[PDB]
Amino acid sequence: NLTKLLSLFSVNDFTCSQISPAAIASNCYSSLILDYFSYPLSMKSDLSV
């Protein structure tokens, strides 16, 4: 339950590549990797694919 996890936080931006945020909640996968770290909203333009 990922919409569970994202209900704890206040979410400011959600962009995906080769998928959508809608799609990434729904689908099943053989492997999911979650990377997390501290990061300022001021530097959003630098956190881009």
Partner: protein, 49 residues
């Protein structure tokens, strides 16, 4: 339409493949792939070959 159930479309006897609408009469290069998004009436999701 869940973006990650894949269902092979098998050809029935005395019929053409459902993919003949998206696969050229001659394939340009070995391994080329074709896609076509489906209308909600057609079932949603995609057709792929």
């Amino acid at each position: 339409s869940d973006d990650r159930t894949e269902v092979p479309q098998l050809v029935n006897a005395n019929q053409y493949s459902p993919c003949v609408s998206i696969v050229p009469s001659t394939v340009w290069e070995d391994g080329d792939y074709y896609r076509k998004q489906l209308s909600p009436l057609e079932g949603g999701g995609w057709l792929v070959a």
